[PDB]
């Protein structure tokens, strides 16, 4: 991360219209479509043997959720994304063994899901900004 | 490897989108300019600024080219020949570039066909593009 | 996409290979293993320690299914459907561990296989055991 | 990087043996037939367009004989790996453009390099060594 003055804003500028939950229900819901593997570290959830059931599963609502609160508030603490992930660092490499790879598909589904639902707004120079942040919080995801 | 179902997620999706494939394209290259401007690099001899006649040009090109693979989803190493000598033999394109360009792309599907952007229509996408990829970084 | 030239480098090495490739495999499986322990995880069922019947008997299933692949290079996805269904719907296995195996397959061919492990017959492989990869992580 | 006493051990009892030039001449050289699109970094070399015409060119072992040197040197500084990559890390991050995946590839084809070269002595444990101190080079060449 740089993250000059303008990208920062670009980011927050939208961040305020954001509704987490949805954004976080639709992103973690696509991950575990669009790319299977990662349902079997997510199988305390129940059913997600297809879409209808993965996106209609109040455990997958309610932790994508959780996800983008903790994606938010490493927003406002820009200048520290690593001392700000760090335990989850530790839970997500050490306790689940996540192959870091699959932090930069979460950013990148997070990514369409704020395209999908902010159609006017996710303009290609605010996309730019959000691939960056996205970016920052996988690095500092897998630093451990 | 795409599914029955895959194909018909692409089928369905390409022909509604139509006419517009072009548009969207076009806005893709931009994306995937601006938010990785390391790809700029193999587009140095063309005007690349965002709304530039270059790029309206280009995304022709690239949107005819998808079409034909999705005209020949059962044989795409046979239909996009021609493009896998250009992507791997002349321009020896980094494939991380592809991902980049895969994703710039449904981004802008994500944004554009709303509600049909599906997470089932969504899976089938990736699939399809990333099957292109591996045709066009081939030899 | 394998070319004409990759299979047949890829059908002479397995033929000559021939009766020690459940051998090479099980010692993949041990490399895999030891560089890359976060893959036993998937294994906890089985005895993994080093020279182990399990291993040995596991070495024996994968290189038939890798035999099989090679008898059918222009339709992998057919001949390795129900490895598909094992791999993608009930184990769930992140693509990253097919990476490390085949990683790890490829350094005991080069140990095993001396002057015969050229570059050419490298690359061939590389892109066989990927495409192998893409059909078992499929769905 | 932990690498423990041990593991250190692994890598400089094989390294004591190794031949820098033959070694780095073997990875370099199986990078660009295996991987062809790095070939595009390379073309102040001359004609890379078939395996023979990489084999055999001069630039290539030369090169190889380089990148190998270097690598041989980090092995010297194993506990400061970011500080002693630093220069390269900006040279082939912000000059060249190369992305970090292929730093990681490189990596990989010197460990095959090493098992073509050395077959009794590269056995799982030792690879094992190698793939830690592989990755790390990787990441520090990444850093910037
Ligand atoms: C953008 C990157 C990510 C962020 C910000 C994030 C955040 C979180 C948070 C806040 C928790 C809850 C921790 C707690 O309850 O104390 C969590 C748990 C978890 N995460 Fe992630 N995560 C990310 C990526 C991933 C990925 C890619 C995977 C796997 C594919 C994953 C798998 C899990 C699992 C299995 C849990 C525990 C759920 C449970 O059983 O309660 N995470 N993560
Ligand atoms: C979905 C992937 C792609 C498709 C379907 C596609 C299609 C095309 C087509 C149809 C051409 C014109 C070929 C000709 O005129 O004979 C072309 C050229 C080119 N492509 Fe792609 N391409 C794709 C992905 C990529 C990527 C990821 C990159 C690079 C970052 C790339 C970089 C280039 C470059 C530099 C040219 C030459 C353009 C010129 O001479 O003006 N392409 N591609
Ligand atoms: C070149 C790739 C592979 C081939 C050709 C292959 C082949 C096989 C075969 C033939 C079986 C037995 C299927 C049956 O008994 O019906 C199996 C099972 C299994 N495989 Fe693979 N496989 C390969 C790659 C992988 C990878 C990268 C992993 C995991 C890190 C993996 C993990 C497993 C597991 C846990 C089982 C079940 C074993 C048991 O029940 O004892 N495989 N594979
Ligand atoms: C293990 C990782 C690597 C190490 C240790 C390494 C090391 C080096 C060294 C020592 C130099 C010479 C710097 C100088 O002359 O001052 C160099 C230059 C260079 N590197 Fe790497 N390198 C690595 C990976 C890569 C990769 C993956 C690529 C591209 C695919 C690459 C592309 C280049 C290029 C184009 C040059 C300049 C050659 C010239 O024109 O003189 N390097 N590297």
Request: with cysteine; hydrophobic share 45%.
């Amino acid at each position: 991360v740089h993250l000059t003055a303008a990208e920062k804003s670009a980011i927050l500028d939208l961040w305020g219209k954001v509704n987490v939950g949805e954004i976080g229900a639709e992103a973690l819901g696509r991950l575990l479509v669009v790319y299977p593997w990662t349902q079997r570290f997510f199988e305390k959830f129940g059913d997600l043997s297809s879409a209808s059931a993965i996106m209609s599963n109040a455990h997958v609502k309610s932790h994508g959720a959780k996800v983008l609160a903790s994606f938010s508030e490493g927003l406002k603490h820009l200048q520290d994304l690593k001392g700000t992930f760090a335990k989850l660092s530790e839970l997500h490499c050490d306790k689940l063994h996540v192959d870091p790879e699959n932090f930069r598909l979460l950013g990148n589904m997070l990514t369409i899901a704020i395209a999908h639902h902010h159609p006017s707004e996710f303009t290609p120079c605010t996309q730019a900004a959000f691939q960056k942040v996205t970016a920052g919080v996988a690095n500092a995801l897998a630093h451990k | 490897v795409l599914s029955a179902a895959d194909k018909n997620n692409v089928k369905t999706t390409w022909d509604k989108i139509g006419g517009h494939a072009a548009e969207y394209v076009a806005e893709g290259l931009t994306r995937m300019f601006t938010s990785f401007p390391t790809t700029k690099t193999y587009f140095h001899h063309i005007d690349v600024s965002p709304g530039s006649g270059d790029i309206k040009a280009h995304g022709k090109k690239v949107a005819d080219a998808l079409t034909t693979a999705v005209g020949h989803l059962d044989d795409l190493p046979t239909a996009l020949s021609t493009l896998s000598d250009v992507h791997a033999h002349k321009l020896r394109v980094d494939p991380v570039n592809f991902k980049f360009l895969n994703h710039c792309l449904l981004v802008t599907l994500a944004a554009h066909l709303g509600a049909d952007f599906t997470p089932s229509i969504h899976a089938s996408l990736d699939k399809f593009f990333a099957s292109v990829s591996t045709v066009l970084t081939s030899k």
